[PDB]
């Protein structure tokens, strides 16, 4: 052992004193206590040591610094901080969705069709789409909404049976391209 003893004696004086020592008075303090001429390089040790002391520039020092003892060790260098308390994901529970944005153009007729398609693994067949519309939402509404196969093709995959455009089926297409 050697450098560990130099380390431990500077924390010993500074801890015993509690009130730190000015860097200019440190060398004669060291000479008095440990009977040795402090080399100038040990000042550089004092500047870098995280476990022995802290160099401080109190406002009254002006042109020199105080060596406080190691009580200020390990301030925010835990290297385990992400798991010391591991807080929940959001900024706070009141902010569970930091993101913001708006939905797509989906008027009530599109919404009726889109949910209605969602209710059936069978899809809705060309006649069953009107029947299920009127039954489920308890409405009797314009043929402009329930016979306009094109608007239904905006909300649904429309595909045919018995021939091209001979009989029709609807499956969900549920357009929601909006990301913001």
Curated annotation (Swiss-Prot):
Tissues expressed in: Mainly expressed in testis. Expressed in spermatogonia, spermatocytes and round spermatids (at protein level). Also expressed in the developing lens.
Domain of life: Eukaryota
Region of interest called Disordered, as start-end residue ranges on this chain: 75-104
Subcellular location: Cytoplasm
Compositional bias of kind Basic and acidic residues: 75-86
Gene null: resulting phenotype: Mice develop cataracts and glaucoma and males are sterile. Within 4 weeks of birth, mice develop a posterior cataract that becomes severe with age. At later stages, the lens fiber cell compartment develops vacuoles with lens capsule rupture and extrusion of fiber cell mass into the vitreous. In addition, the mass of fiber cells passes through the pupil into the anterior chamber of the eye. By 4 months of age, iris flattening is detected and anterior chamber depth increased.
HTH OST-type domain residues: 3-71, 105-174
Protein purpose: Component of specific cytoplasmic RNA granules involved in post-transcriptional regulation of specific genes: probably acts by binding to specific mRNAs and regulating their translation. Required for lens transparency during lens development, by regulating translation of genes such as CRYBB3 and HSPB1 in the developing lens. Also required during spermatogenesis.
Known partners and oligomeric status: Found in a mRNP complex, at least composed of TDRD1, TDRD6, TDRD7 and DDX4. Found in a complex containing CABLES1, CDK16 and CDK17. Interacts with CABLES1, CDK17 and PIWIL1.
Family: Belongs to the TDRD7 family.
Record-given protein name: Tudor domain-containing protein 7
